[PDB]
Swiss-Prot record:
Effect of K185A: Strongly reduces affinity for DNA
GO MF, one annotated term: molecular adaptor activity
UniProt name for this protein: Interferon-activable protein 202
Compartment(s) where it occurs, according to its Swiss-Prot or TrEMBL record: Cytoplasm; Nucleus
Species annotation: Mus musculus
Taxon lineage: Eukaryota, Metazoa, Chordata, Craniata, Vertebrata
Impact reported for H40G: Abolished homomultimerization
Length: 199
């Protein structure tokens, strides 16, 4: 009876309602064959921004820029908000609304330096806008080398390569990539919810 369907392993349920303002939301996309589409979103309170993964497509209309929504029975997976059918998502009441500080909006849309990304814990989910230095396509994987002014890192995508035709010099917007660290150079690797988009 599946109230944790599509939800990450050790995600914590939050029953208390939280009002947020929607900052950004991607289009729905297929992340896994046979599964309902999902989309990525970023959302903010007065004190913080959150990355959001929503697995219920009945909610896309709720996730529009500058809309205030009240969310309850959502899951928290190491700081990432995950929303399925269990959640209640309603239009916010006027007195639940608020001003979002400029610094919160800025840091929500900000891209970390690659050198700084490598300092995060292994398993940290990575988001951001990066320039492509080069790419290698083989049959089983696409391997990007992304760079900024100071550093570079390898990005591995081993899922469907239908719309991953980006080229040298293009900027990629990455969503929910896994930072992998261990015996060797850190890499970013695609995972279940990984998504790439231009612009």
């Amino acid at each position: 009876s599946t109230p944790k369907k599509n939800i990450s392993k050790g995600a914590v349920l939050h029953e208390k309602p939280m009002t947020v303002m929607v900052l950004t939301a991607t289009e729905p996309f297929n992340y896994k064959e046979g599964k309902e589409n999902m989309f990525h979103a970023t959302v903010a309170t007065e004190s913080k921004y959150y990355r959001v993964k929503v697995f219920n497509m009945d909610l896309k209309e709720k996730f529009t820029e500058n809309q205030f929504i009240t969310i309850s029975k959502y899951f928290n997976s190491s700081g990432i908000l995950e929303i399925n059918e269990t959640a209640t998502v309603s239009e916010a009441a006027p007195n639940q609304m608020f001003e979002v500080p400029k610094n919160i909006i800025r840091s929500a849309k900000e891209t970390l330096k690659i050198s700084k990304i490598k300092e995060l814990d292994s398993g940290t989910l990575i988001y951001g806008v990066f320039a492509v230095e080069k790419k290698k396509v083989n049959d089983k994987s696409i391997t990007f080398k992304i760079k900024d002014n100071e550093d570079n890192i390898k990005v591995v995508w081993d899922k469907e390569q239908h719309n991953i035709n980006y080229e040298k010099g293009d900027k990629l917007q990455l969503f929910s990539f896994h930072l992998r660290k261990g015996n060797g150079k850190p890499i970013l690797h695609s995972g279940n919810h990984s998504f790439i988009k231009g612009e």
